[PDB]
């Protein structure tokens, strides 16, 4: 075994009844000295390194040409002036195995952490030396973390897309379905995950040009999408991941769920296609009263009313559909469907549960469209318009398709530096640059919506790490108070930066005037309620930082009304997975699954304690499965009220908790305003 791995295994070797947590720093030192410093290509100067990387098609030349070499050298000096040291071996291992640039033969390492960060900052700044140095300070302090696509591929020629997600609306036509397959493959080859809304597709047994019982339902389209994502497997290095979302009132909802059953035959089962279920409040009401529900055939509704099933408010039109003889449906049991959802999530973790009315109750851009579906990570909730892809040599009607411009704030490092405002504004600027520089030619709706909506996703991570390292239990009301204050601050400064960008560019996002930002309805709870901490301990955490008040929110509302808002969406909390190791952070705002992660790499067993774990804060780092899921729902809903998009909310379930417990958690999440539920992780 290697020396660093052997030293890492001494974490679990307990002496005097305590874990040898100090051995981890020795593991980082051994790892670097024995592997990294030996297998990193070193050049006589930064000029030779840059020439080698651009000439050998490792870096793009366009973004480096915006700076003189003096500016680039100063930026790299700023990155290395911090003298950043990885505090855990797993952080360095993750970076130098996944995100560090390597030679074409993968034998050596071309990029350090201070090199990848410098290149990403130079990409973000776009010719500005001071902005590049600010980004370098932001990332080397680990206050803000660009998403895995953005961090990996910024300024590199051998890349994919910096966009993490692609949310595609699939219209009810063979041409539209074929274009959905094409766009799904063209966006999977770019690396980003693709989510598709299949609620517009007509159900099984529907008519294709007045011949009845002709359709095979959305399950055939899921088969096509699953094989399309399998084909676009990105070399197999990361398997093609795709999501499919269906409204729970869609007739195919039972067959949609039947594909995730283990007992399901290979003739119906889909493997690479994750599934999500969109649940309007009407379904929850029907389940609550234990009255028979109806799943409708979408094409009958489209023929009768001229509008798609998912474009109509089901809370208002459910009765109209039911008493309509020209609308086809079959009676179902909403409580039986809820139990089926609970057991499917217990067995496989699917489907993602999207509470449509919870999303659209506080959705700012309902005028553009209501949020009909979420992304593969079940955290992006944006307005989308379907695209009517017509026959060849006929002009297509291009709609709006959602894309992830993701970035995560490290709550621990953000609040240690007392720079919530600066970090949020710089992250918003970086995400704006990523959205602007994204130009996807094979996805027309994605490109059009990226140009028009200018939506970005600014998430946060290391919530549990910050709370445990500050002596706050995740389920404690003080933790919820801190999350309320912190995410209200994040929302305030994200809105402020969006309005500042709109003022400086003279343009807002498309159809901004109809949004609640323009009408001032979005800021109602912010100008009516004070989100300052209610606990003295929590208020001390924000000391040295100006917490926005009701009057400050009124000034921000006036500023937005006068100048507009550049981004339709700004905040969405992604799961923050493999990049959380590099930032030495807990994943997302979720609680930690295990105090010490047991990971297998090759023939070695590697251990990763969560950052800041020690004897004093051992019980503050409570495992997620040990937590009360209701209090985690409370925490997320406290965070959710300050996030305009959704949060990737994973349910951590014990083996002893039945499907009724999972359904209770789901219904409490719906009752508390949770927008989406990502996963049901059973231990």
């Amino acid at each position: 075994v290697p020396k660093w791995i052997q030293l890492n295994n001494e974490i679990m070797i307990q002496k005097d009844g305590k874990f040898q947590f100090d051995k981890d720093k020795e593991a980082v030192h051994s790892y670097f000295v024995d592997y990294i410093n030996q297998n990193t290509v070193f050049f006589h100067n930064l000029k030779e390194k840059l020439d080698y990387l651009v000439e050998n098609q490792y870096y793009e030349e366009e973004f480096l040409s915006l700076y003189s070499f003096e500016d680039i050298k100063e930026v790299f000096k700023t990155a290395y002036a911090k003298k950043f040291r990885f505090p855990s071996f797993m952080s360095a291992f993750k970076f130098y195995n996944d995100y560090a640039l390597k030679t074409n033969d993968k034998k050596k390492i071309l990029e350090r952490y201070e090199d990848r960060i410098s290149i990403v900052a130079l990409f973000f700044a776009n010719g500005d030396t001071e902005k590049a140095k600010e980004y370098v300070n932001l990332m080397i302090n680990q206050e803000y973390q660009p998403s895995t696509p953005t961090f990996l591929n910024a300024g590199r020629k051998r890349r994919g897309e910096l966009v993490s997600c692609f949310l595609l609306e699939v219209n009810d036509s063979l041409n539209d379905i074929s274009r959905a397959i094409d766009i799904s493959m063209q966006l999977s080859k770019l690396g980003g995950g693709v989510s598709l809304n299949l609620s517009k597709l007509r159900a099984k047994g529907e008519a294709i040009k007045d011949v009845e019982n002709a359709t095979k339902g959305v399950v055939g389209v899921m088969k096509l999408l699953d094989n399309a994502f399998r084909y676009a497997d990105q070399m197999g290095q990361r398997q093609g991941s795709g999501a499919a979302y269906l409204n729970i009132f869609h007739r195919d909802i039972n067959d949609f769920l039947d594909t995730k059953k283990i007992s399901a035959d290979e003739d119906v089962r889909v493997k690479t296609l994750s599934i999500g279920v969109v649940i309007p409040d009407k379904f929850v009401e029907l389940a609550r009263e234990d009255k028979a529900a109806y799943v409708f055939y979408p094409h009958t509704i489209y023929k009768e009313y001229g509008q798609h099933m998912d474009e109509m408010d089901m809370n208002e039109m459910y009765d109209k559909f039911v008493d309509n003889p020209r609308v086809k449906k079959e009676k179902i049991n909403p409580r039986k469907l809820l139990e089926k959802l609970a057991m499917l999530r217990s067995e496989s973790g699917y489907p993602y549960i999207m509470f449509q009315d919870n999303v659209n109750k506080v959705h700012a851009n309902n005028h553009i469209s209501k949020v009909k579906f979420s992304n593969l990570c079940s955290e992006v909730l944006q307005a989308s318009q379907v695209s009517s892809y017509t026959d060849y040599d006929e002009e297509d009607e291009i709609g709006l398709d959602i894309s992830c411009n993701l970035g995560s704030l490290n709550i621990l490092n953000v609040m240690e530096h007392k720079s919530i405002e600066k970090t949020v504004k710089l992250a918003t600027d970086s995400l704006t640059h990523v959205s602007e520089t994204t130009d996807i030619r094979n996805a027309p709706a994605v490109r059009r919506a990226n140009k028009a909506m200018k939506s970005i996703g600014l998430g946060a991570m290391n919530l549990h790490g910050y709370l445990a390292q500050n002596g706050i239990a995740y389920e404690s009301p003080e933790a919820r108070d801190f999350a309320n204050t912190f995410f209200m601050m994040v929302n305030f400064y994200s809105i402020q930066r969006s309005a500042e960008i709109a003022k400086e560019k003279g343009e807002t996002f498309d159809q901004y005037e109809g949004s609640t930002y323009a009408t001032g309805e979005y800021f109602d709870k912010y100008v009516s309620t004070d989100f300052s901490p209610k606990y003295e301990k929590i208020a001390n955490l924000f000391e040295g930082m100006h917490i926005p008040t009701t009057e400050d929110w009124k000034k921000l509302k006036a500023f937005v009304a006068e100048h507009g808002m550049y981004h339709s969406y700004r905040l969405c909390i992604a799961p923050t997975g493999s990049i959380s190791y590099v930032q030495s952070s807990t994943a997302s705002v979720m609680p930690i699954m295990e105090r010490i992660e047991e990971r297998t790499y090759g023939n070695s067993k590697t251990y990763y304690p969560m950052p800041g774990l020690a004897s004093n804060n051992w019980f503050f780092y409570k495992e997620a499965y040990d937590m009360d899921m209701f209090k985690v729902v409370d925490m997320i809903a406290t965070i959710q009220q300050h996030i305009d998009q959704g949060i990737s909310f994973t349910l951590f379930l014990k083996d002893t908790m039945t499907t009724r417990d999972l359904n209770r958690i789901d219904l409490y999440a719906h009752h508390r305003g949770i927008k989406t539920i990502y996963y049901a992780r059973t231990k």
């Binding site: 929850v284 389940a287 609550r288 234990d290 409580r335 809820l338 139990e339 057991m343 039945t658 499907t659 009724r660 417990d661 359904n663 209770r664 219904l667 409490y668 009752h671």
Partner: peptide
């Protein structure tokens, strides 16, 4: 298990 829902799981 596969414990069914009752009327009291829909109010909190």
């Amino acid at each position: 298990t596969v414990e069914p829902l009752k009327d009291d799981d829909f109010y909190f």
